[PDB]
Amino acid sequence: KIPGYTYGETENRAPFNLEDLKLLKEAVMFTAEDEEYIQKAGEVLEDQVEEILDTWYGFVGSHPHLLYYFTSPDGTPNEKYLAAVRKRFSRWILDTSNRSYDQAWLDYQYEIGLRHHRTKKNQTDNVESVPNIGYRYLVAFIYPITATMKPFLARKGHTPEEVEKMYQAWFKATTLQVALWSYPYVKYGDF
Amino acid sequence: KIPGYTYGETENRAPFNLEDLKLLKEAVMFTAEDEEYIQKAGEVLEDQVEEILDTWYGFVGSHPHLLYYFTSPDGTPNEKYLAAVRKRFSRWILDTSNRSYDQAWLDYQYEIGLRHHRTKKNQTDNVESVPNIGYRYLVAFIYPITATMKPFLARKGHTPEEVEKMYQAWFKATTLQVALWSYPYVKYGDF
Ligand code: HEM
Numbered sequence: 001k002i003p004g005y006t007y008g009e010t011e012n013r014a015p016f017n018l019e020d021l022k023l024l025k026e027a028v029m030f031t032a033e034d035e036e037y038i039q040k041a042g043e044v045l046e047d048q049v050e051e052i053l054d055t056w057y058g059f060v061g062s063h064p065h066l067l068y069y070f071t072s073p074d075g076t077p078n079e080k081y082l083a084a085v086r087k088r089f090s091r092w093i094l095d096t097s098n099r100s101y102d103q104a105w106l107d108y109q110y111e112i113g114l115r116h117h118r119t120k121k122n123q124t125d126n127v128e129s130v131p132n133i134g135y136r137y138l139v140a141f142i143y144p145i146t147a148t149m150k151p152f153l154a155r156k157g158h159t160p161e162e163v164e165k166m167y168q169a170w171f172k173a174t175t176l177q178v179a180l181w182s183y184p185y186v187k188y189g190d191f
Numbered sequence: 192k193i194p195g196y197t198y199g200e201t202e203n204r205a206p207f208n209l210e211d212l213k214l215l216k217e218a219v220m221f222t223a224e225d226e227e228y229i230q231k232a233g234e235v236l237e238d239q240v241e242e243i244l245d246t247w248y249g250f251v252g253s254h255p256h257l258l259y260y261f262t263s264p265d266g267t268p269n270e271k272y273l274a275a276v277r278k279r280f281s282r283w284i285l286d287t288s289n290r291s292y293d294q295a296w297l298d299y300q301y302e303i304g305l306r307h308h309r310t311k312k313n314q315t316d317n318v319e320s321v322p323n324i325g326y327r328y329l330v331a332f333i334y335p336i337t338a339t340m341k342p343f344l345a346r347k348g349h350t351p352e353e354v355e356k357m358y359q360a361w362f363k364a365t366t367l368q369v370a371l372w373s374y375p376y377v378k379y380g381d382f
């Protein structure tokens with residue numbers, strides 16, 4: 001159904017476990033309250049996903065040095081690559097809100113890190129593109145990912161107090177994930 | 192005056208330049224509007240720094256796996272290390288708000304990265320402590336650094352609209368810096 005999407009079936013145990021996740025949740029101040037509100041964020045965002053994708057890919061597409069990461073060697077955007085990734089990105093919005101953050105979730109977080117990194121970039125879709133996404137931009141993107149989501153959370157007729165709690169949960173969850181995705185980028189033993 | 196604080200006098204040119212910084216600012220959505228409001232954040236936070244430090248170090252100190260990074264080999268917090276770092280952290284609050292983000296600023300961002308990493312950790316204060324701060328926690332800390340600051344920004348009798356703009360500027364600036372600090376942690380050529 002979603003080409004290349006292998007959540008829960010990588011058959012590869014990540015190099016981090018639930019104890020690692022507990023300590024990382026503590027560092028990012030994520031608790032059971034955020035679990036509640038991230039789920040509620042999923043209810044709000046579910047039927048706005050197409051517009052979210054348009055916004056997100058609009059941001060990427062308007063910056064040549066960002067759109068770069070989806071380009072063919074000739075410098076033009078690879079439209080097959082963009083379309084296939086867009087489907088998996090859309091699903092990630094739902095996963096972030098709806099999935100339990102358990103070992104299967106960690107195993108896919110390792111996978112997503114590997115796919116941004118040179119280790120696995122451009123293999124899932126069998127495309128020819130740039131070899132690596134510089135780690136600096138994964139961290140930077142914590143901000144726009146959070147900023148893209150804010151207006152959409154405010155839209156579904158929920159209380160502003162609930163909106164703030166959903167937004168903070170989303171900020172924490174995005175930060176948590178990017179922290180895990182540093183694994184293949186970071187010198188062994190420094191993560 | 193501040194022991195170990197060597198901003199603007201490292202005499203070492205960072206491996207990133209103003210073009211790198213321009214592209215990273217674009218990725219984190221930082222503009223001249225944020226320059227304005229981060230400066231205004233500095234006016235607000237200046238006379239609350241002691242309370243900010245208490246909050247921040249309170250968070251670190253209440254989590255044994257975080258306080259770990261300041262511990263002597265015997266597992267007890269090194270109080271000399273805590274005190275010396277606290278002075279440089281306090282100054283960093285002001286620097287973030289007040290400094291122009293120019294080459295000198297980049298050169299100190301490289302330095303701060305090096306000091307969290309095993310490359311330079313525990314050398315500035317000539318202490319014996321744990322060798323490295325795992326990069327996962329630098330990313331994670333983007334959230335509490337931003338969450339610690341929010342209440343203080345809301346305190347100095349400014350409009351809530353200005354408060355929101357100061358807070359967003361602070362979020363962007365913190366993310367920007369952590370992205371740069373990945374440099375010594377990231378495999379060469381993957382940053
Ligand atoms: C907060 C930061 C980021 C988030 C949340 C994010 C999210 C995602 C997701 C969910 C996927 C699909 C994962 C899967 O295969 O199931 C993906 C892949 C991809 N992302 Fe990101 N991403 C981030 C940073 C970046 C940056 C900075 C770029 C640069 C434009 C980028 C470009 C791409 C590309 C090119 C792929 C395809 C990688 C491949 O060949 O498999 N991502 N991203």
Ligand code: HEM
Pocket residue numbers: 195196197251257258260261276279280283303306307311312313314315316324328329330332333336365369
């Ligand atoms: C957003 C993330 C972080 C920020 C903004 C931050 C800020 C700072 C600053 C401003 C300094 C002093 C720099 C200087 O020497 O002038 C410092 C040093 C230090 N920080 Fe962080 N820090 C972050 C992440 C962390 C984490 C996750 C830990 C773990 C507890 C930590 C523990 C320390 C320690 C132990 C030092 C002393 C390093 C040395 O030996 O030189 N920091 N930090």
